[PDB]
Design a protein around this ligand. Sequence first.
Ligand SMILES: Cc1cn([C@H]2C[C@H](OP(=O)(O)O)[C@@H](COP(=O)(O)O)O2)c(=O)[nH]c1=O
Ligand SMILES: [Ca+2]
Length: 129
Amino acid sequence: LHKEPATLIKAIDGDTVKLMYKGQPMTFRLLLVDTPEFNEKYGPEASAFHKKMVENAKKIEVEFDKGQRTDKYGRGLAYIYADGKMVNEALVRQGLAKVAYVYKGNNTHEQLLRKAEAQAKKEKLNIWS
Ligand SMILES: Cc1cn([C@H]2C[C@H](OP(=O)(O)O)[C@@H](COP(=O)(O)O)O2)c(=O)[nH]c1=O
Ligand SMILES: [Ca+2]
């Protein structure tokens, strides 16, 4: 897998973000995670977390997996990095997302993320509190 450039257009919520990729605006859905919706518990906190990570980043990068790159809604499916740190993983690690939506063939970082979830759960963080 390969990291590719992109620039923030705007934060949306816990697990979606508007980025410019190859010069075109796209909504990205984070692979392998599920954040609460803004109106649900920890929804606002997920959104804020993602927002901060991406707004403070100097270098946003997009990493596609081996499978489908767009979902049925036209959202790009990727791992997103903010100054080299994966937002997908950081959400999980903080108990602000659950590992979810693990489809065969777009699941390269599954075990990395499940390790983060296990630590978040041990620490009883946020969702796991
Ligand atoms: C994360 C992800 C979601 N989706 C689809 C499955 C879900 O369909 P449904 O809308 O039919 O539930 C929806 C979940 O996204 P959200 O959690 O953003 O709603 O997006 C994929 O198809 N592939 C993926 O990798
Ligand atoms: Ca969601």
